[PDB]
Amino acid sequence: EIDYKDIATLKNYITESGKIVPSRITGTRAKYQRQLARAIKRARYLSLLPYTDR
Amino acid sequence: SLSTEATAKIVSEFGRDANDTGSTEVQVALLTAQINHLQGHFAEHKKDHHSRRGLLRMVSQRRKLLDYLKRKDVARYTQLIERLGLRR
Amino acid sequence: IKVRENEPFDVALRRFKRSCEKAGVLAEVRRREFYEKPTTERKRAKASAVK
Amino acid sequence: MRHYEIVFMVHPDQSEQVPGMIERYTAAITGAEGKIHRLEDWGRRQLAYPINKLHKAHYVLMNVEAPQEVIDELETTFRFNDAVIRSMVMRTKHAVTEAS
Amino acid sequence: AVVKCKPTSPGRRHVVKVVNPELHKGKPFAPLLEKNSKSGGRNNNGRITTRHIGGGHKQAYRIVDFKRNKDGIPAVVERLEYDPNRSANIALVLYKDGERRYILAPKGLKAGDQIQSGVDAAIKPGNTLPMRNIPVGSTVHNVEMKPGKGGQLARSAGTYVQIVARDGAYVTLRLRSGEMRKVEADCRATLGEVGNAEHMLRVLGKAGAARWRGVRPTVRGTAMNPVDHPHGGGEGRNFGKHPVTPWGVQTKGKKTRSNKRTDKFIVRRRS
RNA sequence: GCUUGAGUCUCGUAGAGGGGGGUAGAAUUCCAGGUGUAGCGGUGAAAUGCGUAGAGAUCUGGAGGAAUACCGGUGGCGAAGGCGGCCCCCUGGACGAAGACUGACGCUCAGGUGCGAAAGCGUGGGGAGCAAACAGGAUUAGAUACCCUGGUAGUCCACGCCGUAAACGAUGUCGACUUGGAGGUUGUGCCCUUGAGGCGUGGCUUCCGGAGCUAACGCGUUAAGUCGACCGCCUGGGGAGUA
RNA sequence: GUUUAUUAAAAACACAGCACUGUGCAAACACGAAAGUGGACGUAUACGGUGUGACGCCUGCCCGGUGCCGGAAGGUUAAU
Ligand SMILES: [Mg+2]
Ligand SMILES: [Mg+2]
Ligand SMILES: [Mg+2]
Ligand SMILES: [Mg+2]
Ligand SMILES: [Mg+2]
Ligand SMILES: [Mg+2]
Ligand SMILES: [Mg+2]
Ligand SMILES: [Mg+2]
Ligand SMILES: [Mg+2]
Ligand SMILES: [Mg+2]
Ligand SMILES: [Mg+2]
Ligand SMILES: [Mg+2]
Ligand SMILES: [Mg+2]
Ligand SMILES: [Mg+2]
Ligand SMILES: [Mg+2]
Ligand SMILES: [Mg+2]
Ligand SMILES: [Mg+2]
Ligand SMILES: [Mg+2]
Ligand SMILES: [Mg+2]
Ligand SMILES: [Mg+2]
Ligand SMILES: [Mg+2]
Ligand SMILES: [Mg+2]
């Protein structure tokens, strides 16, 4: 569901600078936000998403 | 915690019949098994006070029940403390 | 961070940098000594926001 | 039983040596009681950031089910192999397929 | 294990002993012993050189293997025993072909574990292989200055050397002194750090403890007469001069490295 | 004797709960090299300080220490202190569904035992930034201060000691009863189930407020309201938490 | 514990401990015109020199002088 390989959708919760979008803006739930951020960090470590566009 | 298989084994060993989980004897057996299992975990590390707190919780309960039993059936009590090897 | 403006840019007017946070992160980070401060910077204005 | 999900990367140059790694690791996993539910490789693909100025590392994903001992020796195999770069081990995941 | 002696009598109050219950009580392996022939600090002319040496215990000698040239023949450690010729303990190793030798003892050697030497070998501590096939950033026991010569560096208790760079035909090493040195990549070195790291924690205590280790008293120069030391002289504890060695060379400074042949490999000096 | 207090068993859930090990990105500092040249830096304004023995700025390579930028919240966990990168091993507690089992096994607790921020002490390591003491430059009538330039202990690690904080919700623990409204977080049941929906039932948590209480401020189902069990503490200010 | 054999046994020397400093191994250093030897069949948890002298609490300010360490600027400067 929230696996770290699902790049083709996990782009929407990342800004142009690699920033994570808060739930206040996204509209997502709290538990889902937590697991989504954790999966984003995991994919970022495994080199699927960039830490920064720099 | 303890494994389901070990818990069922101890329950069937110490309780009278099936589903006899509330008996003081099975309570004592489960607490003793957990304490013995955690002995090695606390031999290693020995810096985990948060878990040692739960260990002390277990120890206090066993003692409280062992007393209830000794106040009911000294017989049962003695046999139990002999089986599990305690109450020095 | 980067500007990719269309071929007509006039005198190179910065329209996308201005819409972006510009100095959002810059101003957020240029401050110092974030140890004893945050415990007391907390909402309570949100509370005053009421009819 | 506690299943594991192994993901690892390889040097882009050693593209032809990945199948040997996969077929050798699958033997070690399945030796005692292992059983792979999801084996796949993405192969070459551009990286997000340059790991020591490298690109197009091979991504290999596996869903194994084996005890801590075999998986520990398998994990240190990565730490000591120079052809691999990164590694990750994740929980059960309930054996989902594809998800690419 | 470090143990503090109780203050029964003057001489035991400040004695700190190191206890190693996993050493061998019996006698050493006789076929690997030799004569030691204490010298007392005298050279072939009979003149005292390197003062403050004399006396001690009989101190037989053990033949320790430093070359470590046994390729493809695994060995198992039988036991650890005390060696009086060095600060580190030694391990007796038996090979599968029926030969016994002495080696230095890494930290986690214990007993009854396989040891592989030379050529390809596991990266586990204890094995020996050339640095051409050792990962960068790993601790090793005793490094050979030249290939096939024998480990010389970091051979003392609890000492180790870590590799910093391998690019080229040489390898950069950070020695315990805190200096960078280049060594040929073909030189061998065993993995880990030699054990007995509790060595400093001893305190000896009484003067006899140092006496029966072969160390004689040291007399301060200021306590002498001007005829036998640049210091000394004057009535009432006067010094009034720059410290020097008994032969007139300045101490507390005045670097004395005068080798122009080995400066090639000294990447950075001690700090 | 009994099962409603207390407890055990089965299936699940959330969480920076705790201990050990590993690894990743950004940035500061430092070292080597390349281009380059008169300033850099700092203040209210300056100076000290660094630089023509080539600084600052900029690019390449390398070393090492420390903390994990948003996510992040009228969020969560923990008895308290307190706990935020990611991954693995060991491990404690809490909550929900019914079902079964024991049968008062309970509450509180002087003495006693354990845990306990920061600073501090002992031994051995490590030491990039920050920074008591200390040095210099400023301001001032004076400035051993606020400001500026450096900078040691310390801050970090392992094992021991210290046992103190506005250690605060300035509110001891346990149990029962007493109108509501608006939120957050985490479970669960029924249904035209069309939906990011209707109707219920638990745990924790934020705000506003009724009766009541209170010297007042205010508290108000998480009481400072009505009661019960036990413990701790107070008797004008200073002297003094001192001899 | 040691000391002025034969007028001085001590508060003098040594001492365990502490600190600074040199030393990467053909180590520093010492004896030796040299070969060579000790250091050491040791390898920075090692060795040499210097000061202080168990242990407890501590060890403040000054780099102007002398010494030592570092410094592709500049001035002066031998042999050739
Ligand atoms: Mg001495
Ligand atoms: Mg005299
Ligand atoms: Mg003289
Ligand atoms: Mg005098
Ligand atoms: Mg004088
Ligand atoms: Mg339980
Ligand atoms: Mg008390
Ligand atoms: Mg502290
Ligand atoms: Mg300390
Ligand atoms: Mg320290
Ligand atoms: Mg300052
Ligand atoms: Mg108090
Ligand atoms: Mg607090
Ligand atoms: Mg508070
Ligand atoms: Mg109070
Ligand atoms: Mg109110
Ligand atoms: Mg007092
Ligand atoms: Mg005497
Ligand atoms: Mg005499
Ligand atoms: Mg010689
Ligand atoms: Mg003296
Ligand atoms: Mg004195």
Swiss-Prot record, chain A:
GO cellular component, one term: cytosolic small ribosomal subunit
Entry keyword set: Acetylation, Ribonucleoprotein, Ribosomal protein, RNA-binding, rRNA-binding
Highest taxon in the source lineage: Bacteria
GO BP, sorted A to Z: translation
GO molecular function list: small ribosomal subunit rRNA binding; structural constituent of ribosome
Keyword Cytoplasm: no
Family: Belongs to the bacterial ribosomal protein bS18 family.
Role summary: Binds as a heterodimer with protein bS6 to the central domain of the 16S rRNA, where it helps stabilize the platform of the 30S subunit.
Subunit structure: Part of the 30S ribosomal subunit. Forms a tight heterodimer with protein bS6.
Name of the molecule in the record: Small ribosomal subunit protein bS18
Native source organism of the sequence: Escherichia coli O157:H7
Lineage: Bacteria, Pseudomonadati, Pseudomonadota, Gammaproteobacteria, Enterobacterales
Residues of the full protein shown: 20 to 73 of 75
Curated annotation (Swiss-Prot), chain D:
GO terms assigned for molecular function: mRNA 5'-UTR binding; small ribosomal subunit rRNA binding; structural constituent of ribosome
Modified residues (N6-acetyllysine): 93
GO cellular component, one term: cytosol
Record's keyword terms, sorted: Acetylation, Ribonucleoprotein, Ribosomal protein, RNA-binding, rRNA-binding
Domain of life: Bacteria
Keyword Ribonucleoprotein annotated: yes
PTM annotation: 5 different forms of the protein, varying only in the number of C-terminal glutamate residues, were isolated. The sequence shown is form bS6-6, which is the longest. The first two Glu are encoded by the rpsF gene, the other Glu are added post-translationally by the RimK enzyme.
GO BP terms: cytoplasmic translation
Assembly and interaction partners: Part of the 30S ribosomal subunit. Interacts weakly with uL2 in one of the 3.5 A resolved structures.
Family according to the record: Belongs to the bacterial ribosomal protein bS6 family.
Chain's role: Binds together with bS18 to 16S ribosomal RNA.
Name of protein: Small ribosomal subunit protein bS6
Naturally occurring in which organism (per UniProt): Escherichia coli (strain K12)
Taxonomic lineage: Bacteria, Pseudomonadati, Pseudomonadota, Gammaproteobacteria, Enterobacterales
Whole sequence portion shown: 1 to 100 of 135
From Swiss-Prot, chain E:
Gene3D superfamilies: 2.30.30.30, Nucleic acid-binding proteins, Ribosomal protein L2, domain 3
Modified residues (N6-acetyllysine): 241
Region (Disordered): 27-52, 220-271
Family annotation (InterPro entries): NA-bd_OB-fold, Rib_uL2_dom2, Ribosomal_uL2, Ribosomal_uL2_bac/org-type, Ribosomal_uL2_C, Ribosomal_uL2_CS, Ribosomal_uL2_dom3, Ribosomal_uL2_RNA-bd_dom
One example of a Gene Ontology biological process annotation: cytoplasmic translation
GO molecular function annotation: RNA binding; rRNA binding; structural constituent of ribosome; transferase activity; zinc ion binding
PANTHER family xref list: LARGE RIBOSOMAL SUBUNIT PROTEIN UL2M, RIBOSOMAL PROTEIN L2
Protein name in UniProt: Large ribosomal subunit protein uL2
Species for this entry: Escherichia coli (strain K12)
Gene coding for it: rplB
